Design a binder for this molecule. Sequence first.
Ligand SMILES: Cc1cc2nc3c(=O)[nH]c(=O)nc-3n(C[C@H](O)[C@H](O)[C@H](O)COP(=O)(O)OP(=O)(O)OC[C@H]3O[C@@H](n4cnc5c(N)ncnc54)[C@H](O)[C@@H]3O)c2cc1C
Ligand SMILES: NC(=O)c1ccc[n+]([C@@H]2O[C@H](COP(=O)([O-])OP(=O)(O)OC[C@H]3O[C@@H](n4cnc5c(N)ncnc54)[C@H](OP(=O)(O)O)[C@@H]3O)[C@@H](O)[C@H]2O)c1
Ligand SMILES: CC(C)=CCc1ccc2c(C[C@H](N)C(=O)O)c[nH]c2c1
Length: 426
Amino acid sequence: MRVCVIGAGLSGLAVGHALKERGISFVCLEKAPDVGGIWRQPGAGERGPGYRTLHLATAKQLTGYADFPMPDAYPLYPRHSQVAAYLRSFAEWAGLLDHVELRTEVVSVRQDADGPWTVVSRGADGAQVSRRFEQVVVASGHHNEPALPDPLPAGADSFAGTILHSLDYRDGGDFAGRRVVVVGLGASAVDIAADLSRHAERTLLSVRRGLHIVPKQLFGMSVDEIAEAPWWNEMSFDERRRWVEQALLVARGRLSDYGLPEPDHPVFSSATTLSDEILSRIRHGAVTPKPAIASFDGDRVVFTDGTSEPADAVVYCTGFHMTFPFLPAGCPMSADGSVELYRRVVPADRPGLYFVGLVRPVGAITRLVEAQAEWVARLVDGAAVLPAADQMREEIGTYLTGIVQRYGRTEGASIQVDVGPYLAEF
Ligand SMILES: Cc1cc2nc3c(=O)[nH]c(=O)nc-3n(C[C@H](O)[C@H](O)[C@H](O)COP(=O)(O)OP(=O)(O)OC[C@H]3O[C@@H](n4cnc5c(N)ncnc54)[C@H](O)[C@@H]3O)c2cc1C
Ligand SMILES: NC(=O)c1ccc[n+]([C@@H]2O[C@H](COP(=O)([O-])OP(=O)(O)OC[C@H]3O[C@@H](n4cnc5c(N)ncnc54)[C@H](OP(=O)(O)O)[C@@H]3O)[C@@H](O)[C@H]2O)c1
Ligand SMILES: CC(C)=CCc1ccc2c(C[C@H](N)C(=O)O)c[nH]c2c1
């Protein structure tokens, strides 16, 4: 009655925990058959951003809910199945499933002239129902629409094999004894390459720009555990930038020595894929570096340096787009399309709406959504207030004009945050 929470991933869950602790009535509508978000999908063969080999890249203690520790036998990087089974164990403990409508997908959301909102949801019977609520929190994710390159390289329609996106990938056992291209240097790209490097007769990583490849451990310490140590927070922003450069060199060496393009920017300048595996697959011959796909010649793939190779599939690890279709009116958007959310959560012109988890931090997202949830729980029953709308559009203007001095102009920088100072204001 009081709050519709869209989505039962890691964030929607932290939301209900906040509202329930406080006394607010709410429901959680999710389209999937259970709770968990993306972490439910590969353990169930469902089409999604993940794959049957995915693990956490962040330390378990820094990633679990601070009131519900993970099972002590979990390793530092649990498998996607361990994670999903843990997220349902919180919903059971914290007391929330009676509020959760599974297999119920939200289709429409519109603000009514008098203040409440009208949510239309389609369920399992493929049918429809309209409802009214006081407030609404969006917790749907930002990895839902895949971003293919525009355009495809010439001749893609006369290709012998299949062309697919990382969202369609599950296991390489489906590419056993075939020959595959992987497009991208992202988090999914190196993971799927390394998986295909043990099933396909031959795997190739096509790359157009260089990113800094970093292992998930320096001095036995996870990269995000290093982040919290005080001697790291003791160093300056140029001291630690080099501390890292020196260490990387000792651990892996230089990237052009593996056949890979040098990034055109120092560390922290928008580039870090984490992987314990990808370089060693290259030094073992299991994956071969290529330079950008230029045309589809029949059953072969022509690249930009003139080389060519027989291939039966191309898996595109090119990322995702941020879309909210149940919001007829466009979601937090500006002119150039930068996100405009006061403190990365609240719209300025739409009382009663909130977005949780639309933030990209360095490391675990959890303590960030926890603060977002706890604050929003006090803005719903009045224990918390907001600035006037003008004064709110100024904080946003300050956040944006200042993030161009760090990543310059691009597309997904508008939700980039520093875990340290962000959580200090909650
Ligand atoms: C490949 C990948 C690897 C990651 N690795 C890490 C990592 O190692 N460490 C880390 O800390 N973070 C990691 N993250 C980030 C973070 O853990 C995830 O974004 C996390 O799942 C956040 O969950 P969420 O609730 O924000 O969103 P989601 O997981 O997307 O959950 C949102 C839910 O909304 C539901 N939904 C969507 N639309 C509707 C609708 N219209 N009606 C009803 N329900 C709807 C979906 O079914 C989904 O369950 C990773 C992200 C990705 C994509
Ligand atoms: N858990 C983690 O470790 C982690 C880390 C960072 C982000 N994430 C989140 O999780 C998501 C999963 O990462 P991801 O690997 O799927 O996405 P990603 O990090 O955005 O990877 C995209 C890759 O595709 C390339 N690419 C994009 N458009 C291209 C084009 N038109 N032609 C050629 N190459 C192109 C990019 O190189 P270019 O630079 O040339 O575009 C880049 O190498 C990310 O989108 C992000 O939201 C997770
Ligand atoms: C050593 C140093 C350069 C590490 C830099 C770094 C490490 C991890 C991430 C992530 C992953 C996180 N799991 C998420 O996307 O939610 C996003 N950006 C990152 C930057």
